[PDB]
Structure 1
């Protein structure tokens, strides 16, 4: 399974091992003033989004065939999938049974430590984490499903058939994996969680809208561009 192996490898290299989990800012209990934020909460919010986008862009460059799509198409796919991938990956790696968010750099933060920057959104992502975890999606299936989040039709693709071919290829790889484990239907079960995920993408845009309104610190330009480019209207 050579595409599968490459996908797994790209996934594992885009995230921290248990070895490299960074507890240096983690606090088991903080006492926040809920419903408000300060500049450092907002900057950290954006820094975490920024750091994830860089990691995702490197992950994507490892999905065989992706780096040969047009540069515009690469950028388009990445922007339209970014928040969904940030959420899905964060949920898959976090430990909601401990209130722990684990970000792609290895940084661990307690839910209470994310409350001011993220608002309600982080408590919602942790709920989806529990929902996702109860499906018991294995790493290779996740490696495929995450790639399929990114490699998908989008309005404005220059070469939509080449994206569709790559989507076909990954979906076949996934099908062959789930057969091999079995020795198509949990799929239905997993797709049942998609509305929760979509709602979460929306909530992310809602949070960024609010923070832009408030403007304690501006979003970094690359995030701001994703926000603006993905607003239908």
Structure 2
């Protein structure tokens, strides 16, 4: 209720206003169409732009600043890719091939293809599927917080992370009921996305590995760190 309102405000302050959208660079027609250095740099720049945004968004989740600072960092690092994808999927318009990034920048899928590779198509596929659920903003504000606030290996206080998650899952569950008859299949349908999101996170790690191999442009340090810390080996 007040948790819910707090989650909604954090979500909406973390993205651009429909009026701050920038189509300055949008172009559906590319030419004369393997990645080069400018595609690799833009890929890392787009990823980097979500960094601060997602960190400031997390600090506004009630309870999150009360986790230990080491657990805060671990949760943020481990969830970054997944959050970047989920928020991009929800914000974008896959029917038109339109990617909308957290800064307001709008790009066509073909303008991203070279930097992202196949991953961008799998992100758009997930976006169309997310869209069919017609997830409203409150449900989505809870969902994304649950992507962040979740069990990870190396937490100092995993029970406290679990209680905050229970707190947010109750809030979501209630909200879904308040909006759809009485006295799950919506709910469990929404939660069913979380496993698909983990799989796209992996495609992202694969893409970064590949770009790191090819080495046209090195990843910026913070991205690199996320990449190395999240490798279970």
TM-score (norm 1): 0.96
Please give the secondary structure, in 2, of the residue aligned with 1:27: coil
Kept in 2: contact 1:48–1:103 (CA 8 A): yes
Give, in whole Å, the separation in 2 of the partners of 1:4 and 1:122.
Answer: 31
Give, in whole Å, the separation in 2 of the partners of 1:120 and 1:40.
Answer: 18
Deviations 1:161-193 (A, max 9, x none): 111111111111111211111242212223344
Kept in 2: contact 1:28–1:110 (CA 8 A): yes
Kept in 1: contact 2:176–2:187 (CA 8 A): no
Cα distance change, pair 143–137 in 1 and its aligned pair in 2 (3 A): same
Deviations 1:7-32 (A, max 9, x none): 00000011112101011111121125
Cα distance change, pair 159–192 in 1 and its aligned pair in 2 (3 A): closer
Give, in whole Å, the separation in 2 of the partners of 1:194 and 1:65.
Answer: 21
Kept in 1: contact 2:26–2:108 (CA 8 A): yes
User: How far does residue 157 in structure 1 lie from its aligned partner after superposition?
Assistant: 0.5
Deviations 1:111-139 (A, max 9, x none): 00001110111111111100110011110
Kept in 1: contact 2:139–2:175 (CA 8 A): yes
Query: Where has structure 1 moved over 4 Å in runs of 4 or more?
Result: none
Kindly tell me the number of residue pairs found equivalent between the two proteins: 231
Deviations 1:61-115 (A, max 9, x none): 1001111211110000011111111111100010011110001001000000001
Cα distance change, pair 69–32 in 1 and its aligned pair in 2 (3 A): farther
User: How far does residue 198 in structure 1 lie from its aligned partner after superposition?
Assistant: 2.5
User: How far does residue 195 in structure 1 lie from its aligned partner after superposition?
Assistant: 4.2
Q: CA RMSD in A?
A: 1.2
Give, in whole Å, the separation in 1 of the partners of 2:11 and 2:30.
Answer: 32
Task: Report what 2:6 is aligned to.
Answer: 6
